[PDB]
Amino acid sequence: SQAIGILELRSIAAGMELGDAMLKSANVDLLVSKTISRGKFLLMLGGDIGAIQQAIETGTSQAGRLLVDSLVLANIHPSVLPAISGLNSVDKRQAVGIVETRSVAACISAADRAVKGSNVTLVRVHMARGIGGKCYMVVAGDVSDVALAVTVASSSAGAYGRLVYASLIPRPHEAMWRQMVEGL
Amino acid sequence: SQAIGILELRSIAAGMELGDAMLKSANVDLLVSKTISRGKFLLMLGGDIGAIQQAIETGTSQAGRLLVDSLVLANIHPSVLPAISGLNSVDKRQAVGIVETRSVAACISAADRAVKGSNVTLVRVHMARGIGGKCYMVVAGDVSDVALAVTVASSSAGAYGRLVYASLIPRPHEAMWRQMVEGL
Amino acid sequence: SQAIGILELRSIAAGMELGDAMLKSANVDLLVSKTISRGKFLLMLGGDIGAIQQAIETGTSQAGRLLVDSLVLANIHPSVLPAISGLNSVDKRQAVGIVETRSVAACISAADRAVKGSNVTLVRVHMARGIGGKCYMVVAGDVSDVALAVTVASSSAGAYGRLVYASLIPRPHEAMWRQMVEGL
Amino acid sequence: SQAIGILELRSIAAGMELGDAMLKSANVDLLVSKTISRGKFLLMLGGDIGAIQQAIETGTSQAGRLLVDSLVLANIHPSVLPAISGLNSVDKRQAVGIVETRSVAACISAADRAVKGSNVTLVRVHMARGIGGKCYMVVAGDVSDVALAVTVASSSAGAYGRLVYASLIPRPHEAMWRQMVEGL
Amino acid sequence: SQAIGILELRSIAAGMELGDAMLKSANVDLLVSKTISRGKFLLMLGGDIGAIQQAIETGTSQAGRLLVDSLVLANIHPSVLPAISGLNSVDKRQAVGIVETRSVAACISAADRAVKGSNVTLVRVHMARGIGGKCYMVVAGDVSDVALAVTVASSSAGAYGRLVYASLIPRPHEAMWRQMVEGL
Amino acid sequence: SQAIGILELRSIAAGMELGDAMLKSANVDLLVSKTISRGKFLLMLGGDIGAIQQAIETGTSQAGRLLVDSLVLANIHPSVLPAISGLNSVDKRQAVGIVETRSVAACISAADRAVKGSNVTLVRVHMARGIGGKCYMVVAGDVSDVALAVTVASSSAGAYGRLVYASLIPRPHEAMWRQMVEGL
């Protein structure tokens, strides 16, 4: 199915010459393109596995030694990709769970295995910064649906030692709701 | 409600003179008592918060230099106590969950935070070797309630970080099952 | 012919979620599964070279950081597999041979190089504690065939140097016998 | 009177070829033989001072580099030998005494200095793990004779300082009792 | 019941200004008042727990930084106190036991638990010097009475790691008698 | 029965003055007398235990500090001695086994116990150099006879930690034959 591509650079200008260059390389779509402290830059792609590799190989080779890190992920549930570049609309307020990971590489793995393993709506996959720091996912649904989403995430991230904490809020406060599902 | 008391001794003989002692001191129940490598000894007690606090107060005051450590845990779901000393009757085979911890202090606190929080039956709590070794609990029930129990147990054990791994098995094999709920 | 697969994990719970997993993954047989001090876990599998390679490929890819080590052994005399998991029926008392090794990887390779090479019946293969601890095999039969088996086992284990000692007992005492072929 | 012989080997297989050997060498009795962590092996023999000295002389000369250590103990109260290999029939429940030592060499010398010195029946001598690990004896009888046995055992073991702790329990609980005189 | 108070100073003159000052502070009684090598001084009190604390608090505060150590013990069998400042008269020559301890604090504990735990006559509690060196007790009575006195002392001192040796002489030589019970 | 005597010197001329001097000292026979790198010299004797000791004591005392090492072995099967100074004639081409040892002292022990323990013909006991380096034996006979010869050798050398490898060639190539039994 779909794929996630990531390209992290040490120069902000390069990430934009390499941002516009991967858009013309294949039919990939841009999800994240923001500066990271203190000087690094982040690019996140998605789409067909062919387009992604053809786009990530494109940027990596041109980046040369400006490239700080680049990864590509495959077999990603399509409902993960809009959780990266934005949110997903909640159907109705219900139970919530959050899984915090130690590296963004493990964060997408735990969500992919969480949507393909339950019925929750993956709300958003936000990162406090970078590609090696605190990243979290948010999921909502039944008290049971969320309960299964966390355990598969707590396993897929725990099996790689990149897990910080995972909690479940069955009755989330009206305030905390509009912060976990909407961010503010 | 109920309470757990634990006393660890540097001596096997010192544990037994104090073992019979706390039995007479009040109205507690003897839970665990066996050799801990390379020669430490472990005691566990389950009764009322009053009977446990005085019994443990009897042991820590007379253990002296042979006392390695002691701890008191209270407000415990009663079914935690028989899962410590023995097994709980598995009504019918269903889903199985196991949380593995590094500290039995964090194992019981995770086990207590499971039976209060879900409809699973706390099958057993085992300690492979030591009060700082690989302890783990087992819970069984519907795939829904088991996933919740594994998460509330991993939340309480993960906030203390003594969480090693926590997995859920919905469809356990015939060979696997008689080894999780019975041990052998 | 047949094949052996082995997966060692840093976690007891992680071994069991993966244990039930490789059972469903193909057509293998569960050989060994128990706690390894101070808290590692061991898995062994016996089936066909195809079913074992994919099952082990399922486990090493999902064990992650909890994976201590893994290994695949193939082209195995079938009677090695039951000597691993249990005992083989001693027809009549005769001579006894035992080769003791430091690595179970070298123990099975010595055990396989014994039953193919002599008419002895591979009684049992035991692992006192660990995949790097004192493992040993036992073979029985005529004093002639047993001496050959001890030598071909010590040749294959001595070229790897993980050979500790290998002795032959032609006239085993009544007390000795029920301890070598049965263990107790 | 009688005598005890002890031979400790670095190899499990080397212990068994030599085990059957000393059985044929004279008229001794096989007392103990089991795996000692992490892979040492232990042998104990009980017979006559003549049969034990030659049997041990047979083993130390042929053990070579695999020999960890050996020792001969003589002029032993006969009832020490069955307390080493097994248990002694507790006639009726009474007072219980236990002396815990660090060395089995000092444990037997304390146990021998107990049955000669009091009317207690030496219930059992156990070795939790190793010839340098937590060994201990158990004696039973009147509260009078048990206290004397614990003292003469602690005097002989305390002059060697390998004494860990020595306690007396006059009124042992029902749970405590079946664990001291039987072990479980 | 009664109490033991101890005050150890670094100045001999101060221990006598503070010796006469605690006599007028309450109704306490003086037991020991001798110089310790090389310059330290010892004061030992007894009587009601109120008088002792009121006397020991008196000396400690006035001693200031001349105070080397001060302790107070409670629930002391009254028959211990004359064994400190002197001896107790033997009713008839019989069995004897001696318990040597590593600190005077543990020496009074083992005797208190020895008289309150048997029927022996605590003869004397002498110290070779100081409050942190070799101190011993002497007890006499039946062969059984002494046997129980030693084991409770060997436990009360062993549980705190301040025990050196404990022996029992059932038939003490006529000479050694007038040295353990009378000192010379 | 017979005996083996060995005398290793640091001077080549001394080993020949001491070579001719032990021939006139008793009725001993000379087996080996060759230079060892880089300057050491080797003398090997045989015959009655009286003659050997009387010859080895003769050379050792005269050698003074030129003596690098000297040993004497007793109860040697007479068929070992011609395997040292030369070969033994093969009756018919059959199975072959070779045992390599880490010190010449263990090499003669494993052969002595090999001829006295089977029916093979000990072909030759050659050393690549010195008395502390790679020495091997060669034996021929049945596939079974050799199989027993190796295991007793692999034990007698393994029990002293001076064993390198031991193999068995049941169908030795026509070429390798004339190299293991004849040397070339």
Side-chain angles (χ1 to χ4, degrees):
Chain A
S1 54
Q2 289 290 266
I4 294 301
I6 293 184
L7 195 63
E8 170 172 77
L9 292 323
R10 217 184 133 84
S11 169
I12 305 159
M16 302 226 178
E17 160 168 299
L18 293 190
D20 172 68
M22 290 182 302
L23 286 182
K24 312 174 182 169
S25 100
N27 190 31
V28 310
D29 294 336
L30 170 62
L31 318 173
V32 181
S33 171
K34 58 195 171 193
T35 305
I36 301 315
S37 200
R38 184 192 312 286
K40 310 179 308 171
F41 197 84
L42 183 47
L43 294 169
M44 284 206 51
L45 301 183
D48 288 340
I49 172 61
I52 284 315
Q53 293 182 349
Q54 173 182 112
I56 295 303
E57 155 76 14
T58 298
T60 49
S61 67
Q62 287 185 27
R65 293 187 183 98
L66 265 178
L67 176 54
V68 177
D69 219 349
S70 64
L71 209 44
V72 170
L73 307 186
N75 315 295
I76 303 299
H77 200 253
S79 73
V80 162
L81 288 63
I84 306 178
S85 39
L87 329 169
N88 280 324
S89 83
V90 185
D91 45 322
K92 45 191 172 185
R93 178 163 112 191
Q94 270 153 167
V96 186
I98 308 196
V99 162
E100 180 168 0
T101 66
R102 198 144 272 294
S103 163
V104 76
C107 191
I108 322 175
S109 274
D112 184 61
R113 219 151 306 166
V115 277
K116 297 181 175 184
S118 71
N119 302 89
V120 313
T121 307
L122 178 49
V123 176
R124 64 181 187 116
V125 187
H126 179 266
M127 311 125 288
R129 100 183 175 205
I131 81 171
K134 300 302 186 59
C135 323
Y136 52 117
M137 34 187 294
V138 197
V139 290
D142 306 0
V143 200
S144 36
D145 282 359
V146 176
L148 193 58
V150 188
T151 315
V152 173
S154 294
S155 292
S156 191
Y160 294 105
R162 299 175 164 184
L163 171 57
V164 178
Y165 190 76
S167 75
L168 188 156
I169 310 91
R171 291 170 295 99
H173 213 270
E174 320 94 19
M176 311 275 328
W177 170 267
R178 303 162 59 98
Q179 180 180 12
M180 315 188 197
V181 305
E182 311 210 40
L184 300 188
Chain B
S1 55
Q2 299 295 275
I4 310 285
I6 298 182
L7 192 77
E8 172 157 277
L9 296 323
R10 299 200 166 262
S11 171
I12 306 173
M16 290 207 164
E17 159 181 284
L18 288 196
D20 173 46
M22 290 181 278
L23 291 195
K24 308 161 147 170
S25 80
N27 182 16
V28 306
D29 313 312
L30 156 59
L31 295 182
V32 190
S33 147
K34 70 179 178 190
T35 325
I36 306 315
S37 211
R38 182 136 308 180
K40 313 178 296 176
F41 203 82
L42 172 66
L43 299 183
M44 297 196 49
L45 290 184
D48 306 314
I49 172 61
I52 289 289
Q53 282 176 339
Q54 161 204 79
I56 290 295
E57 189 48 60
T58 301
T60 66
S61 76
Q62 315 181 11
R65 186 204 48 94
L66 309 170
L67 173 53
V68 201
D69 211 343
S70 86
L71 185 66
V72 183
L73 304 191
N75 277 288
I76 311 285
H77 194 290
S79 57
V80 164
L81 283 66
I84 293 178
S85 80
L87 322 163
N88 285 342
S89 36
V90 179
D91 42 278
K92 60 185 178 179
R93 176 153 125 190
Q94 257 156 326
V96 192
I98 290 176
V99 180
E100 178 181 12
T101 72
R102 289 212 161 274
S103 166
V104 54
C107 197
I108 307 193
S109 307
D112 187 72
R113 208 141 309 173
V115 277
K116 288 180 177 185
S118 60
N119 274 97
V120 315
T121 294
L122 175 54
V123 177
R124 77 184 176 106
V125 191
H126 183 268
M127 299 163 314
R129 44 156 315 151
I131 74 166
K134 292 305 173 59
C135 315
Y136 56 96
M137 42 183 283
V138 191
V139 297
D142 291 321
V143 198
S144 56
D145 306 313
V146 167
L148 153 75
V150 183
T151 298
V152 195
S154 312
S155 273
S156 163
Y160 287 75
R162 315 169 183 194
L163 166 57
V164 189
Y165 191 77
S167 57
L168 171 133
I169 298 93
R171 301 158 286 109
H173 212 249
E174 308 93 34
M176 289 320 299
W177 167 273
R178 295 135 55 79
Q179 202 194 355
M180 296 190 203
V181 294
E182 297 168 21
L184 319 173
Chain C
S1 55
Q2 299 295 275
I4 310 285
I6 298 182
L7 192 77
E8 172 157 277
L9 296 323
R10 299 200 166 262
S11 171
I12 306 173
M16 290 207 164
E17 159 181 284
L18 288 196
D20 173 46
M22 290 181 278
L23 291 195
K24 308 161 147 170
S25 80
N27 182 16
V28 306
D29 313 312
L30 156 59
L31 295 182
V32 190
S33 147
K34 70 179 178 190
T35 325
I36 306 315
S37 211
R38 182 136 308 180
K40 313 178 296 176
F41 203 82
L42 172 66
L43 299 183
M44 297 196 49
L45 290 184
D48 306 314
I49 172 61
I52 289 289
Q53 282 176 339
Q54 161 204 79
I56 290 295
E57 189 48 60
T58 301
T60 66
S61 76
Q62 315 181 11
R65 186 204 48 94
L66 309 170
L67 173 53
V68 201
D69 211 343
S70 86
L71 185 66
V72 183
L73 304 191
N75 277 288
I76 311 285
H77 194 290
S79 57
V80 164
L81 283 66
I84 293 178
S85 80
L87 322 163
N88 285 342
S89 36
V90 179
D91 42 278
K92 60 185 178 179
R93 176 153 125 190
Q94 257 156 326
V96 192
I98 290 176
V99 180
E100 178 181 12
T101 72
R102 289 212 161 274
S103 166
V104 54
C107 197
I108 307 193
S109 307
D112 187 72
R113 208 141 309 173
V115 277
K116 288 180 177 185
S118 60
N119 274 97
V120 315
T121 294
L122 175 54
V123 177
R124 77 184 176 106
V125 191
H126 183 268
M127 299 163 314
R129 44 156 315 151
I131 74 166
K134 292 305 173 59
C135 315
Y136 56 96
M137 42 183 283
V138 191
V139 297
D142 291 321
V143 198
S144 56
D145 306 313
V146 167
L148 153 75
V150 183
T151 298
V152 195
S154 312
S155 273
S156 163
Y160 287 75
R162 315 169 183 194
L163 166 57
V164 189
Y165 191 77
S167 57
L168 171 133
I169 298 93
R171 301 158 286 109
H173 212 249
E174 308 93 34
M176 289 320 299
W177 167 273
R178 295 135 55 79
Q179 202 194 355
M180 296 190 203
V181 294
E182 297 168 21
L184 319 173
Chain D
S1 55
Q2 299 295 275
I4 310 285
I6 298 182
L7 192 77
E8 172 157 277
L9 296 323
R10 299 200 166 262
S11 171
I12 306 173
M16 290 207 164
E17 159 181 284
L18 288 196
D20 173 46
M22 290 181 278
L23 291 195
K24 308 161 147 170
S25 80
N27 182 16
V28 306
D29 313 312
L30 156 59
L31 295 182
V32 190
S33 147
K34 70 179 178 190
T35 325
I36 306 315
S37 211
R38 182 136 308 180
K40 313 178 296 176
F41 203 82
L42 172 66
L43 299 183
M44 297 196 49
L45 290 184
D48 306 314
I49 172 61
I52 289 289
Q53 282 176 339
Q54 161 204 79
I56 290 295
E57 189 48 60
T58 301
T60 66
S61 76
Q62 315 181 11
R65 186 204 48 94
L66 309 170
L67 173 53
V68 201
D69 211 343
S70 86
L71 185 66
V72 183
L73 304 191
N75 277 288
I76 311 285
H77 194 290
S79 57
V80 164
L81 283 66
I84 293 178
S85 80
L87 322 163
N88 285 342
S89 36
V90 179
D91 42 278
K92 60 185 178 179
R93 176 153 125 190
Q94 257 156 326
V96 192
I98 290 176
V99 180
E100 178 181 12
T101 72
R102 289 212 161 274
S103 166
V104 54
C107 197
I108 307 193
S109 307
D112 187 72
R113 208 141 309 173
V115 277
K116 288 180 177 185
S118 60
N119 274 97
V120 315
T121 294
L122 175 54
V123 177
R124 77 184 176 106
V125 191
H126 183 268
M127 299 163 314
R129 44 156 315 151
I131 74 166
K134 292 305 173 59
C135 315
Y136 56 96
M137 42 183 283
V138 191
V139 297
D142 291 321
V143 198
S144 56
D145 306 313
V146 167
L148 153 75
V150 183
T151 298
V152 195
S154 312
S155 273
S156 163
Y160 287 75
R162 315 169 183 194
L163 166 57
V164 189
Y165 191 77
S167 57
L168 171 133
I169 298 93
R171 301 158 286 109
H173 212 249
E174 308 93 34
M176 289 320 299
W177 167 273
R178 295 135 55 79
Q179 202 194 355
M180 296 190 203
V181 294
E182 297 168 21
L184 319 173
Chain E
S1 54
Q2 289 290 266
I4 294 301
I6 293 184
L7 195 63
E8 170 172 77
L9 292 323
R10 217 184 133 84
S11 169
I12 305 159
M16 302 226 178
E17 160 168 299
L18 293 190
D20 172 68
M22 290 182 302
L23 286 182
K24 312 174 182 169
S25 100
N27 190 31
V28 310
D29 294 336
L30 170 62
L31 318 173
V32 181
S33 171
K34 58 195 171 193
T35 305
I36 301 315
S37 200
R38 184 192 312 286
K40 310 179 308 171
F41 197 84
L42 183 47
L43 294 169
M44 284 206 51
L45 301 183
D48 288 340
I49 172 61
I52 284 315
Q53 293 182 349
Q54 173 182 112
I56 295 303
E57 155 76 14
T58 298
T60 49
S61 67
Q62 287 185 27
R65 293 187 183 98
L66 265 178
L67 176 54
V68 177
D69 219 349
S70 64
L71 209 44
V72 170
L73 307 186
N75 315 295
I76 303 299
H77 200 253
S79 73
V80 162
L81 288 63
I84 306 178
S85 39
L87 329 169
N88 280 324
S89 83
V90 185
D91 45 322
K92 45 191 172 185
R93 178 163 112 191
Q94 270 153 167
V96 186
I98 308 196
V99 162
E100 180 168 0
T101 66
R102 198 144 272 294
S103 163
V104 76
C107 191
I108 322 175
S109 274
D112 184 61
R113 219 151 306 166
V115 277
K116 297 181 175 184
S118 71
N119 302 89
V120 313
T121 307
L122 178 49
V123 176
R124 64 181 187 116
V125 187
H126 179 266
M127 311 125 288
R129 100 183 175 205
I131 81 171
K134 300 302 186 59
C135 323
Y136 52 117
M137 34 187 294
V138 197
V139 290
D142 306 0
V143 200
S144 36
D145 282 359
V146 176
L148 193 58
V150 188
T151 315
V152 173
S154 294
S155 292
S156 191
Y160 294 105
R162 299 175 164 184
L163 171 57
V164 178
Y165 190 76
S167 75
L168 188 156
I169 310 91
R171 291 170 295 99
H173 213 270
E174 320 94 19
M176 311 275 328
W177 170 267
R178 303 162 59 98
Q179 180 180 12
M180 315 188 197
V181 305
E182 311 210 40
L184 300 188
Chain F
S1 54
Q2 289 290 266
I4 294 301
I6 293 184
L7 195 63
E8 170 172 77
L9 292 323
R10 217 184 133 84
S11 169
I12 305 159
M16 302 226 178
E17 160 168 299
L18 293 190
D20 172 68
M22 290 182 302
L23 286 182
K24 312 174 182 169
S25 100
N27 190 31
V28 310
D29 294 336
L30 170 62
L31 318 173
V32 181
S33 171
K34 58 195 171 193
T35 305
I36 301 315
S37 200
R38 184 192 312 286
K40 310 179 308 171
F41 197 84
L42 183 47
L43 294 169
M44 284 206 51
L45 301 183
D48 288 340
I49 172 61
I52 284 315
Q53 293 182 349
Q54 173 182 112
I56 295 303
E57 155 76 14
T58 298
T60 49
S61 67
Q62 287 185 27
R65 293 187 183 98
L66 265 178
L67 176 54
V68 177
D69 219 349
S70 64
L71 209 44
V72 170
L73 307 186
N75 315 295
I76 303 299
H77 200 253
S79 73
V80 162
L81 288 63
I84 306 178
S85 39
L87 329 169
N88 280 324
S89 83
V90 185
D91 45 322
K92 45 191 172 185
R93 178 163 112 191
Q94 270 153 167
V96 186
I98 308 196
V99 162
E100 180 168 0
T101 66
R102 198 144 272 294
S103 163
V104 76
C107 191
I108 322 175
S109 274
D112 184 61
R113 219 151 306 166
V115 277
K116 297 181 175 184
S118 71
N119 302 89
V120 313
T121 307
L122 178 49
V123 176
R124 64 181 187 116
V125 187
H126 179 266
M127 311 125 288
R129 100 183 175 205
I131 81 171
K134 300 302 186 59
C135 323
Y136 52 117
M137 34 187 294
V138 197
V139 290
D142 306 0
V143 200
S144 36
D145 282 359
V146 176
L148 193 58
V150 188
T151 315
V152 173
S154 294
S155 292
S156 191
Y160 294 105
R162 299 175 164 184
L163 171 57
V164 178
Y165 190 76
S167 75
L168 188 156
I169 310 91
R171 291 170 295 99
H173 213 270
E174 320 94 19
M176 311 275 328
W177 170 267
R178 303 162 59 98
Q179 180 180 12
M180 315 188 197
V181 305
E182 311 210 40
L184 300 188

